[model samples]
Target: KPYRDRFPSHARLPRAGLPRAEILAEIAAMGAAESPAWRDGYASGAVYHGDEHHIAFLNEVYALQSSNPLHPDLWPSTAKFEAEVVAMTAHMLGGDAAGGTVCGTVTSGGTESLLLAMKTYRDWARATKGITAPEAVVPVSAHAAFDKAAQYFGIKLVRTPLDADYRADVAAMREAITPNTVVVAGSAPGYPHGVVDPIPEIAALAAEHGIGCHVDACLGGFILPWAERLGYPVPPFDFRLEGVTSVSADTHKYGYGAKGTSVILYRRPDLLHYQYFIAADWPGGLYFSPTFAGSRPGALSATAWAAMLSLGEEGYLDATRRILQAADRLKAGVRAIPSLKILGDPLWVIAVASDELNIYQVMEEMAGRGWRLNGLHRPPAFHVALTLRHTEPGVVDRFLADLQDAVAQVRAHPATGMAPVYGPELVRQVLTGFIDLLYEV
Candidate 1:
């Protein structure tokens, strides 16, 4: 209804070209209408860096390097940008501590990074260990991308359960390993409850078994380094660890880069060589491309490079401090609400649950008040992924206030609304339908 009311909804293109000014105005109007929720810190994990200046700078950089990076001879600067982005991310992730042998390539995003790593490990295991059937042991809280990787690359994914604190159970991970297991993975901070898994123990287990260990640092790679320096209780989950053979960090998330940029690092070139595709017998010509895509948005690589160079170490540290401090305030406020309880000890991303209250209803109430929070289920809860926007003057306070009101409303009108409760099977079905809805006219 909104699409028809505001713009053309015809299936076919218009016979006449639309005026550029009018088209631009319509697009601008739509963006303005949809931007406030994320722009004002009412959403979770969607827009990490909402500052206008940062966005504008990235946009300028993107515009300048719109040309493709596949033709390095023509756009050599794009190759430079990609290489430097990888190097900087590696250094930040403890490449120096690993004797400066760490190497990587920029991918489209975290999913691609994880996918490439999985494929690389699968190939490496097949070649090095003569394993025909490959397997990977990962925590249940690991990103769904691992599952995707398993499905795509024909790897058996053995998901181990979590401990009482929502962290991966290292003993369980060890139990799941087999001779065919090619890799073990741990999240620096998993998505479900934002608690870091026992990476050291898991990595050591991989090392003992002579298999690869991958750290999915897509969420915490950029934050935990700074958090540790800021005196937070950050655990070791990077290249500094002896068994962390690979890591995937998203430059777009906490790195303050534009979306579509992430780095996947390997401990040595031998493993990374498997991630590359080199075709020599093609009729087109000799060709080689790293990661998944042959031709990609080199402009995004530029954006990633620009963002890292501009932010530097101090800037990231400062941003991490602000986010963590805001998280502290939010956590304290959440704990003060008698009906709610946090799921785990988290620094920034927080999951809130209630034993006596319908947390989903509370989330819905907050949504009615123009807040966009995440609704989670395995054990009925909701979460808020705090970003720089949440650290703004009154954003955290505003969230607490709205959250308090939401809880009170749910309590007072217990029967006013119904919060959906889905079983795992139904959740999968509903999610598939939701994805289909996204492409509907």
Candidate 2:
């Protein structure tokens, strides 16, 4: 709202254009105004790499390659960038263990990666197993993008509940699978609770059923490999698992890349081929496009490639170590709070809950103190997705101190109105309204 107030609400283009300098000034002003929360580490999962130097480097890369990947003849360098990005991502996620057979393509983001994977499995099953009605068995804690994929591709989604530890119940997932099942999915640390599902078991189940197993590692892809090397307890959630046919990892998030780039890897080329779209009869010309878009920003792919090369293995290792240590401190602080409890044993991302106090009120109080946290409501809780920003000195401590105060405030003055705790219907309404408000002039 403040942004709209400060800038012109361009519902339609102006008959005459403003000066380029003034326009750029206004845009920079908006960015500067909103930078504090994320740049200072008071927000969660929004800005993974907020360092000024890193951002400047990415911006420079984007500017250099401001072309389309669709025209490889014009910008062949983008093809190299995208290919190398995918190769590096696959190798990081146990591609070597899969006998160098793992291959994939770069997608716009996690959602596109997921949607392509879902469609691939659907088509694969139709051709290989002749399943007319395809269904996907997914944990309830899996990313919402899976549900979006199901709806978009006309695949039935069967969500199984989580176990007591907030992890997917493999038994329930197995039971949920029918003959129509095309794929089974697990998360490498789901977004809500930040706990990895029983991926090994789920992958085994998929292998036995002759269906695909997809690991949604969008959140943990960059962190988990280094985390495992750091001696953290990271389960097998990648190509290392025999049944894992595909995996989606977001370079834009933890990879410290610019936004609009993600990697989707398949264990074999055939599975990856189904995700492609080709039109030999197009009047424009014979055409084939990977992922969804016919023409996409090659600059973002360059950014992703640049980020990975710039932040080499050592760079990622150091960033992961700092974030995890900060997470350890934050978790300890939250556990120290009398009424608050952590939902699961998470390494970096943490969800805090309360049985004696209003958790939403605590989140509201935190917001009042300029802390933005993620709110979840199947069981009311709030999460802080630790990023490199959170690993900055004093950030985690400040968060914990504010959180304690927030909880204390909620306890001292209990909510009297209908509590902010949300049910499914209420959650839907709230999210819809929030999205609608974003478009309001």
Candidate 3:
């Protein structure tokens, strides 16, 4: 693939110890090469924001504090940065509700935040709820990280299918719960079709059943709050919801922070306590660390803190406004295409499907036109997540023009080279294999 061809073919090594200048040059080249697709808005869900000034500011912050959180006594300022980042994120999501009891800790990213949440629930259930063999119920659309948590923590995973509108089936989720259930999960807006699960109902069910409810807001956490404030129909999914116990939000995604930083908030500190690892008996002196890693990069937390403070509420709202407006334009253009149909009612992410044409072929067609998008199956579809790049003067218009051409071409040549693999039955097999290859092999 052309993308693969762009990557470096060899790792840098000391050939009689290379000069620092050459090594830095290689590093900068690699980064510059990878930035264009996401930077120019030609890709979906890769880079959330590409504003040059913001990038430079974050880069400067990271360069200043390139230290480790493990040595808090030495890098005490990083501790402040990490704490402030968590607090800001919690408040943004819903910390002020329930008399301001919300608290959280920083993690590496969305997946780690999710893993720590599951691990915390498992221990909390064993210690408080007295359940040894814990189970978890989640919508099938929940991120793959939930499945990873189940595998890592030895919890039984129960996957509930989505309804006709591609929303999680609440009734099926309720039925899947058992006496040993430790946690139930719902995505604010799932990854596949960008449809939000019925989080209010799911949270209420968890409260009624006396189990933990985790709202996976990894994709929509930063965007949804502003959307709700803007009077968009964002259903209650955060701490504002009575039964929601935890949430995972990525600072790197919509928060526009450097990668390797995310937040995991809990209703109370006790629920988050189980994610901590402490040992007084170790020979290396008393040791304590939050989340899975022992020595995390403190600079990432610094970048997150700087990003949040720099953007503030108004900045995020403005960014959300641009993103949603771009999505509206793109969605309208997609609807105008004859063979393409938008799947489900989504806010900023549009998943399009076609009954008459192969969706993968459409994705491939888009790829040929220098656009990258996400692919889905179990009902074949493709999704494009709008970011600030789409708000560029002519980007949306260009996308629409290319999209119309692609659909027409597909309709004209039903037996095109990219058509067969994306057909309904074949798409399922191909998607399953693709996911398996991504995970297992």
Model 2 whole-model lDDT (C-alpha atoms): 0.92
User: Which regions in candidate 3 have their CA more than 4 angstroms from the true location?
Assistant: 1-12, 415-441
- What's the candidate order when arranged by decreasing TM-score? 1, 2, 3
- After superposing candidate 1 on the true structure, give the runs of residues whose Cα lies further than 4 Å from its correct spot: 415-418, 421-428
Number of clashes found in candidate 2: 0
lDDT, candidate 1, 253-350, per-residue tens: 99999999999999999999999999999999999998799889999999999999999999999999999999999999999998899997989999
- Model 1, position 223: C-alpha lDDT score: 99
Tens digits of lDDT, candidate 2, 1-441: 887666778888889988999899988998888999899998889999999999999999999987988999998999999999999999999999899999999999999999999999999999999998999999999999998988899999999999998999999998999999999999998999999888999999999999999999999999999999998999989999999999999999999999999999999999998888889887999898988998899999999999999999999999999999999999999999999999979889899999998888888888888887888988999899999999899998898899888887888898632335442577688889989998987
Candidate 2, residue 206: CA error in Å? Answer: 0.7
Candidate 3 structure quality by residue, lDDT tens digits, 1-441:
233465444445536976799879877877787788888889888888888999899999999997888898999999999889888888888888945788889999999999999999999999998999999999998898888999988999899988888899999999999999999999989888888899999999999999999999988989999998887888989999879999999999988899888999999888988889999999999999987999889999999999999999998999999888888888898888887888888988889999988777777788789888887787888888888888888899999998888877777765445545444667668789888865541
Stronger candidate by lDDT (1 vs 3): 1
